[PDB]
């Protein structure tokens, strides 16, 4: 039974987003989801699809990952990412990486080129250089906008896919939270928290307050509820409902089951998202604002 | 109020040398006694697990702190995590260098930053801001490990869980990682839900074994999922370890305490040093069903 592929993408939990920013975010989200879907509709893998979708958002300055990442307490971008393949649980992740364009791609290089799942900071820096990953200057990742945020504070992106072959996958990438301590790691590179992908269940990517997501293991908690025979929506409502009640943390996630069902749900104010299935594009930011367009 | 309990584990690894066994034995006892010494004072589960793990870090026999296995550059890089079951408060550090006690650094992360996870450079910088002694790195490197890396060139994670006399639980885990690991490789040990989980509403787990496999199956929280579904602790431990072996071909072990004070130590590797203190007795084993149960003064 060859399945109808689906990709879902998110541009991060957010507070209120302005009318103008919404529109730029919309273009970036459509573009990411369009890249992802293209891979899937040419018979690509779920992993290829999630990596592609998230590179798109890393490169795009309107999203807090890669270029457009928030800056740590010291004005520099430090980035976290992870990828996971649902068929064998193979996984790749990186924490505290700097001076590279695409943390998610290196997260894949960890998964594919090493016996390990997770490299960090100085070690992740060395492995990149060794794999032929270029080093780009700091300001290349630093935007003027994120400088104003940092000074104003002082004084996450993801994807899930189901492919033709029935494989599920997730990728997540982030700059983290603004003015963070040097070396702060969030949920993104910690499988079970930043995401989790399993062919016997499905795949999820999360976003929001990184510490809360970790404490509760939101991704695996959503998939627990699914293994229990709750729908993708019900499952999201419980796990998010739990992070809210138990630890007062808010965020969002995206999930696709092995049966093809999907949903974006969030307890933050907004979470830009887009999905693609059966030549149709589903987009939303605020609850109920969802649109559907022909995606030929 | 609840009868307190501390379980400790050394590394879940292959067969152990005859003379190593004695040193290992005494190590378990030291750590379990520390944790139980803390509990018998009415002290917290967080305190006991920290104390137990601290002892194992300081003991050059165990793969954490002094005596950590060596990476590829012949250097010590350490991970640790600790978690408060009360409200799920947690702290963690990874690839940390030239300090005695990663576990204490993670507790500081939990209680003295608004974060739960620091790595490498930032962690060392936080270590400074907290006055943690930056010790000569060569203090942590041992001859057994120096020699062991030369061979691989051409024990495993330690941990503790505890339920205190208020019924709170905690876990703590610390490691030097794996022999000849790549530079800045980070295992399961500082990863919430993999290396360990603690939740007053279910129990506490600390894990050991193939870190990548443990990370892939989210070993610690998995074990808890089963306890939720009604499993006994050993049934749950059997089920999670069982799945790890069948799904990622990984071998490991775990200690668990449930919210009501049911507890077990189980492993799928050949061996796992483990000790438990409860009801005035101390339990200790290395091999499946070799348990000695003796009196604790
Ligand atoms: Na970006
Ligand atoms: Na030690």
Swiss-Prot record, chain B:
Induction: By 5-alpha-di-hydrotestosterone and progesterone. This is Isoaspartyl peptidase/L-asparaginase. The active site is at 157 (nucleophile). Has both L-asparaginase and beta-aspartyl peptidase activity. May be involved in the production of L-aspartate, which can act as an excitatory neurotransmitter in some brain regions. Is highly active with L-Asp beta-methyl ester. Besides, has catalytic activity toward beta-aspartyl dipeptides and their methyl esters, including beta-L-Asp-L-Phe, beta-L-Asp-L-Phe methyl ester (aspartame), beta-L-Asp-L-Ala, beta-L-Asp-L-Leu and beta-L-Asp-L-Lys. Does not have aspartylglucosaminidase activity and is inactive toward GlcNAc-L-Asn. Likewise, has no activity toward glutamine. Keywords: Acetylation, Autocatalytic cleavage, Cytoplasm, Hydrolase, Protease. The keyword Isomerase does not apply. It comes from Homo sapiens (Human). Changing residue 157 to S: Strongly reduced enzyme activity. The modification N-acetylmethionine is found at residue 2. It comes from the Eukaryota. It is found in: Cytoplasm.
């Amino acid at each position: 039974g060859h399945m109808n592929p689906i990709v879902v993408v998110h541009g991060g939990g957010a507070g209120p987003i302005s009318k103008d920013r919404k529109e730029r975010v919309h273009q970036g989200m459509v573009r990411a989801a369009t890249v992802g879907y293209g891979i899937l509709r040419e018979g690509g893998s779920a992993v290829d699809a999630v990596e592609g979708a998230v590179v798109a958002l890393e490169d795009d300055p309107e999203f807090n990952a890669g270029c457009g990442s928030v800056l740590n307490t010291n004005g520099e971008v430090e980035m976290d990412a992870s990828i996971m393949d649902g068929k064998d649980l193979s996984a790749g992740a990186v924490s505290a990486v700097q001076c590279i364009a695409n943390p998610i791609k290196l997260a894949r290089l960890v998964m594919e080129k090493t016996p390990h799942c997770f490299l960090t900071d100085q070690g992740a820096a060395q492995f990149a250089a060794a794999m032929g990953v270029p080093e780009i200057p700091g300001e290349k990742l630093v935007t003027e906008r994120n400088k104003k945020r940092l000074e104003k504070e002082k004084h996450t992106v993801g994807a899930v896919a189901l492919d033709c072959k029935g494989n599920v996958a997730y990728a997540t990438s982030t700059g983290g939270i603004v003015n963070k301590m040097v070396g702060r790691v969030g949920d993104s590179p910690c499988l079970g928290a930043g995401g989790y992908a399993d062919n016997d269940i499905g795949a999820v990517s999360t976003t929001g307050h990184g510490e809360s997501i970790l404490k509760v293991n939101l991704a695996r908690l959503t998939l627990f509820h699914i293994e229990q025979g709750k729908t993708v929506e019900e499952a999201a409502d419980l796990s998010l409902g739990y992070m809210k009640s138990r630890v007062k943390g808010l965020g969002g996630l995206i999930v696709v089951s092995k049966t093809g069902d999907w949903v974006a749900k969030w307890t933050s104010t907004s979470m830009p998202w887009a999905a693609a299935k059966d030549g149709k594009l589903h987009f939303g930011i605020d609850p109920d604002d969802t649109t559907i367009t022909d995606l030929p």
